[PDB]
Amino acid sequence: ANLWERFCNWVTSTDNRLYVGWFGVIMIPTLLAATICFVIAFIAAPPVDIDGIREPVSGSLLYGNNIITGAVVPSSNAIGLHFYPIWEAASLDEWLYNGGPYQLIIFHFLLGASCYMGRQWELSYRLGMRPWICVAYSAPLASAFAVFLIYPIGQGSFSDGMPLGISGTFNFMIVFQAEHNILMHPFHQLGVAGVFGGALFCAMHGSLVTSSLIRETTETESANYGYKFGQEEETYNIVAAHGYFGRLIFQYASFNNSRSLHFFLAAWPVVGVWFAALGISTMAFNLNGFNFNHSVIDAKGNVINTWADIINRANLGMEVMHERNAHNFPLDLA
Amino acid sequence: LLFFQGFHNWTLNPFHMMGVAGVLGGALLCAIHGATVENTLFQDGEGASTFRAFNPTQAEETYSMVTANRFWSQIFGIAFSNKRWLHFFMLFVPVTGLWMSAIGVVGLALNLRSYDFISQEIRAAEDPEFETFYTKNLLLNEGIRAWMAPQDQPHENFVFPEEVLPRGNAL
Amino acid sequence: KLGANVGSAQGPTGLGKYLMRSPTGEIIFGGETMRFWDFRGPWLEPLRGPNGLDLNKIKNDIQPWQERRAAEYMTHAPLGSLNSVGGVATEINSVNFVSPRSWLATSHFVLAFFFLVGHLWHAGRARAAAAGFEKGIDRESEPVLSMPSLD
Amino acid sequence: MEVNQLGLIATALFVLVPSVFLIILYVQTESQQK
């Protein structure tokens, strides 16, 4: 057993408190770098010329933000999709003025999270599990890729990537709605069905299983002590639960098969959020939401407004106001 | 939705935010739980489609809690160990979330908004070089209000001459 | 055409309204399109010199076919709705247009993504099947039960 | 910045009072026999 052999054995060990793994060998350093840079930037970075018009936006705490307003501000529109590592800058001060931290953090993060998914496969394999947890995780990951990488590629600038902050996230959403009418896009609608539905089935499932807990405890103790970790007996009555649910809707809307049920629980939100991710990722190439502006006309030819037209008025407000100093020409073409 | 953004600045409201956490967290739990059970199943049949290998009256767990716990302990650092707590928590997160959003909306009934940060406004009023995403989003809101109010609130008979419409350069 | 000196027109931000410099100095178009200065096209390159866009060529050498082409392309930008209403998201119904580039880009991003998912699915499944646990965990030989506690 | 002067203590107490509560419960649980 030479040294490389033992190194590989430790890396892939199923006994480490946290699994390292080969994916983890990339994950750990990239995630540490992204995290460290993020915390430092979020606390102390100077304002960032996000839209490349020498109009620097302050994102950090020390420069006048709170938790809700603060952000790591996207790199300059002057940079576009150009790679801006620290060593391309003349100085750290230039690097900061132009939003370098943003690129360091999002590239390291995306690599890191990709390896996080890989790692989920990897440990599933080392433990003799079936492998598809990582596929469930692909949905939020794909979303992150959508707002941090794909959308910037489609619009030609990381300055249009989502900001690393709460309010910056809202800014991103609002401008997105202006430029894509995302609410009227069936993929975003599927995404909403996914997360609303996921919340619903989450509560539903939780409540039904909780409802059918087999009595194992007294009134003066938590029912949870009624389940012992690793016990072979199922801790609730799935037949009683199925009976209740079938009666609540009708006999056949219900799952009596736990495997089929849990698969449904995985699939509904995962698929929905996949479609959300693809909504952002295809709206990245400006294939946008349904446009029914002035779709309904009377006999003379008067426009008869629908709610779609009111939406359009709102969108117009967003459009004309966003990045109020950045456009010189009448069409916002990216 | 768009009205609540423009007039109430609803996204800034911590009760809405708790709502979002409850809903997205619920979705997260739904997905992660489903996937976990489905990928820690015991082999209880010979079929490659593993759905048939379950019996509603069976006394045994169909998946391994111990293996799932080790997996998540090593992936994420922590894991459920108690099934009862897991499922109660699956009730608790989205339900609590939706309740909080309800509280926020009750505030909005009175225009009791989380619309501004006063310190932000004092600084920005005094200092025309101070900019954050918060003030940017207020500009968006002002846009929404001005451009949507006449057709959205027709009973007010708003007439906003072109020259008073807030607009940035060119657009 | 109206008499502007486009090389010296200062835009509201202080950057040139029509022309400015790229981060490495090249003369490029101003406004948001500063992000797109890497663009190269047969209609634009005649105006290009060693230092980027040439102000003299811009003053004296712009042919009508170039004007035509710029107007055409400006008015056929790859922006449009799912129901093929051409233009920005707030545009009214009138033009039936969605660019082939949008259709092809979006279609193939969707397909490439679901194929990434497919790769994860069948790769993980292939590993699990080659090792013999794709159908679940053996109750009589559960691997984790033979592993020491994490803590 | 011109922040609400009571913010600080409000936050401090907001953290401290319920946390302490939990800590008390936890510690007296651990000190119980078995």
């Binding site: 606390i43 705490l61 | - | 506690s149 | 922040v3 600080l8």
Partner: peptide, 30 residues
């Protein structure tokens, strides 16, 4: 002092991550 507060609460949360992971009550099979 606002900044100090934000950073303090955050720091506490990270410390808590540390204890909740490495000094958890270990799960035990019966």
């Amino acid at each position: 002092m606002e900044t100090i507060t934000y950073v303090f609460i955050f720091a506490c949360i990270i410390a808590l991550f540390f204890f909740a992971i490495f000094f958890r009550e270990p799960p035990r099979i019966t």
